[PDB]
Amino acid sequence: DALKVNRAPVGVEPQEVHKWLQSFNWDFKENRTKYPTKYHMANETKEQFKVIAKEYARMEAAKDERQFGTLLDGLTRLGAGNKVHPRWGETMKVISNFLEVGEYNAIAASAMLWDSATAAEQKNGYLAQVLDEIRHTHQCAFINHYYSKHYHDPAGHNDARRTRAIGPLWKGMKRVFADGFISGDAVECSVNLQLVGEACFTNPLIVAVTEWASANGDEITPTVFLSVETDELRHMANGYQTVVSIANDPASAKFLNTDLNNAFWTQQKYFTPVLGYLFEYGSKFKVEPWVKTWNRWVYEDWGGIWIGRLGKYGVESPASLRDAKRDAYWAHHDLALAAYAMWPLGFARLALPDEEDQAWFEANYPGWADHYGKIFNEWKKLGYEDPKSGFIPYQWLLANGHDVYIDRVSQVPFIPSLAKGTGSLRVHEFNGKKHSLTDDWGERQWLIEPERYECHNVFEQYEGRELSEVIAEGHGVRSDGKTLIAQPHTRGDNLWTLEDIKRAGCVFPDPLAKF
């Protein structure tokens, strides 16, 4: 009444609100996803990490305060921003800004999962994930922002959102963890984004990499990336809930194995060579062979703990796995050939393997010295590093018949005459246009789905143009307007300029003209 009441101190904890969320939905005819999907099964599932808006914010803010304390206070006072081996500080221009776009697309993919979820609890869970992917976008941005302020070479840390557009490795990044998630079946994002992307590839990409950062003197990236991934346990769990629903309905389960294989191949096609190249060639001190990192995280642990366990319920080992394991052993070495040969189109400064690097490569990948090693050493002798040499290896490749092709589907470069990874060139004409495909899995995708795969490649856009003109047009220069952002060495002297590039007279061909 007006006098008597229980005055014991009480609040309301997040789980007390959460148990009512499922009842927030209501029925009406139009209450269904707006996006196309093959998956129409029942998906009334339960969230494994109960959260409400207020508690979501409390958790993430607590993570942030510790992260930004370490960065803006402790590590800045130590001068840690310039205690990084130049090879690794250059690598983080690419890793952080490329991951940034993956995170950004993950926002959009997570919104498709939000839209296609049928349970209020899952819609709630996917909004939290949508917010996390924004958090990760800003964390990746903050790493390059911090490097811009404290590292000895801010160029390229400070403008990748435009300078990345110059070069061919960026093209494949727009598919791997990007278009491949958001331009397709919305419910299928539970398979490609989550069961594969988040459950498999974020571990080597965001967690394992922090040990290479520390080895090379970078304590900024661990501070941030290790906090990024704390959010991923919610995301994996969201995805698994929908995977269970798919497996439990026979009409939905008949799509799962083909979607899984296509996701695994699509992602590994670029992830495997590009991150392995960045780890091993973009470092001085190496933690372990990339192929061992890949064996641990992708083949044994993800493969056994997720896919192998799900074999009990009809999920098949990806048929492309054999081709992928070959890529894990050699494809990053193939990619390094292209990366070093086309260095002027990037936004990072590269370092040819030194004598101890070469011994390490040969010890862990026998046969490396007689193939890749001899090529790098000959390029060095020709003046690879010297701005007065007039030497750029892409022209040298062409003069010896080592043409570079771009996969119409994955955008990954392919040098059939030098590659040891998986691949073989297929060139088709269709409706007056020539197309180059490079493997059995992507060739099928293009043959069945040509209207999904119309990506212009760098040779088509730049055909007949001289290299320095393309670089200048794309703002591939430092603040003086003439020294390139990209470099073929990591020293502070003898930096290459646009005029140094122009002297080589490198002009883009049409690699398919010969067919």
Partner 1 sequence: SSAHNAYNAGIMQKTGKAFADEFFAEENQVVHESNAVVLVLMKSDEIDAIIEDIVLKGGKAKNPSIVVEDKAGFWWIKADGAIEIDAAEAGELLGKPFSVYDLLINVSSTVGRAYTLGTKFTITSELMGLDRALTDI
Partner 2 sequence: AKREPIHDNSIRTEWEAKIAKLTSVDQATKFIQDFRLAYTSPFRKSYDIDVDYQYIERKIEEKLSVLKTEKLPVADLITKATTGEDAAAVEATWIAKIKAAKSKYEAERIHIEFRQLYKPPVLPVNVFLRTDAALGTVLMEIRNTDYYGTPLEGLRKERGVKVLHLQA
Partner 3 sequence: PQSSQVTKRGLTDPERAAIIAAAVPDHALDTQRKYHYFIQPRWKRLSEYEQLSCYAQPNPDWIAGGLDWGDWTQKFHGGRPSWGNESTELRTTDWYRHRDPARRWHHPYVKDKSEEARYTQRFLAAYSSEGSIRTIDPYWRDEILNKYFGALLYSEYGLFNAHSSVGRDCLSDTIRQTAVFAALDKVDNAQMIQMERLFIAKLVPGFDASTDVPKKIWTTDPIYSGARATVQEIWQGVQDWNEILWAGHAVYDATFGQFARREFFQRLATVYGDTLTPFFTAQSQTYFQTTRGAIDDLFVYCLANDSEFGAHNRTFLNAWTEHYLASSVAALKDFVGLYAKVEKVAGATDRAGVSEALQRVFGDWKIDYADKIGFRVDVDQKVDAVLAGYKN
Which one of residues 296, 444, 482, 502 is an interface residue with partner 2 (CB under 8 A)? Answer: 444
Q: Does 427 bind a second copy (CB under 8 A)?
A: no
CA within 13 Å, CB half, 147: 32
Residue 12 interaction partner, one of partner 2, partner 3, Cl ion, none, beta carbon < 5-8 Å per kind: partner 3
Identity of the residue, 228 or 256, whose beta carbon is nearer to Fe ion in the bound complex: 228
**Candidate segments 64-72, 100-108, 132-140, 187-195, binder of partner 1 by CB under 8 A:** 64-72
Chain centroid to Cα 280, Å, comes to: 16
Residues 459-478 within binding reach of partner 3 (CB under 8 A): 461, 475, 478
Residues ≥6 apart with Cβ < 8 Å to 22: 119, 120, 121
Q: Does 433 bind partner 2 (CB under 8 A)?
A: yes
DSSP designation for 503: H
Residues ≥6 apart with Cβ < 8 Å to 428: 434, 435, 437
CB of 320 to partner 1, least distance (A): 10
Which one of residues 50, 52, 280, 368 is an interface residue with partner 3 (CB under 8 A)? Answer: 52
CB of 303 to partner 1, least distance (A): 4
Q: What values do phi and psi take at 497, rounded to 5?
A: -115, 170
Q: Which residue has the tokens 């081996």?
A: 85
Identity of the residue, 230 or 494, whose beta carbon is nearer to partner 1 in the bound complex: 230
Structure tokens at 420: 């040891």
**Candidate segments 174-182, 265-273, 363-371, 424-432, binder of partner 1 by CB under 8 A:** 363-371
Identity of the residue, 103 or 121, whose beta carbon is nearer to Fe ion in the bound complex: 103
Q: Tell me which of 140, 189, 200, 506 is the catalytic residue.
A: 140
Residue 72 interaction partner, one of partner 2, partner 3, a second copy, none, beta carbon < 5-8 Å per kind: a second copy
Site string for partner 1, 157-176 (x = CB under 8 A): --------------------
Q: Does 3 bind partner 3 (CB under 8 A)?
A: yes
Residue 133 marked in a binding site: yes
Identity of the residue, 231 or 375, whose beta carbon is nearer to partner 3 in the bound complex: 231
Q: Does 122 bind partner 1 (CB under 8 A)?
A: no
Q: Does 234 bind Fe ion (CB under 5 A)?
A: no
Helices 256-281 + 321-341 axis angle, to 10: 40
Distance (Å, whole) CA 496 – CA 515 = 35
Residue 354 interaction partner, one of Fe ion, partner 2, Cl ion, none, beta carbon < 5-8 Å per kind: none
Q: Does 310 bind partner 1 (CB under 8 A)?
A: yes
Q: Does 482 bind partner 2 (CB under 8 A)?
A: no
Q: What is residue 347's three-state secondary structure? A: coil
Distance (Å, whole) CA 301 – CA 249 = 27
Instruction: Work out whether the CA dihedral 16, 52, 44, 194 comes out positive or negative.
Output: negative
- Written as one string, the DSSP assignment of 372-431 is IIHHHHHHHHHTTT-TTS---HHHHHHHTT---EE-TTT--EE-TTT--SS---EEEEET
Residue 103 marked in a binding site: yes
Which one of residues 163, 192, 203, 223 is an interface residue with a second copy (CB under 8 A)? Answer: 223
Distance (Å, whole) CA 106 – CA 109 = 5
- Look at residues 259, 96, 267, 113 and name the one whose alpha carbon lies nearest to residue 175: 267
Q: Does 216 bind partner 3 (CB under 8 A)?
A: yes
Residue 316 marked in a binding site: no
Q: Which residue has the tokens 């059995």?
A: 440
Distance (Å, whole) CA 251 – CA 253 = 6
Which one of residues 47, 51, 52, 70 is an interface residue with a second copy (CB under 8 A)? Answer: 70
How many other β-carbons are positioned within 10 Å of the β-carbon of residue 3? 4
Residue 136 marked in a binding site: yes
CB of 1 to partner 2, least distance (A): 38
DSSP designation for 339: H
Which helix (H) or strand (E) segment holds residue 437: the answer is strand 433-437
Known active-site residue 189: no
Binding site, annotated residues: 103, 133, 136, 198, 232, 235
- Interacting residue ranges for Cl ion, rule: CB under 5 A: 19
Residue ranges for the known binding site for Fe(3+) are: 103, 133, 136, 198, 232, 235
Q: Which residues contact Fe ion by CB under 5 A? A: 103, 106, 133, 136, 198, 235
Question: Which positions are catalytic?
Answer: 140
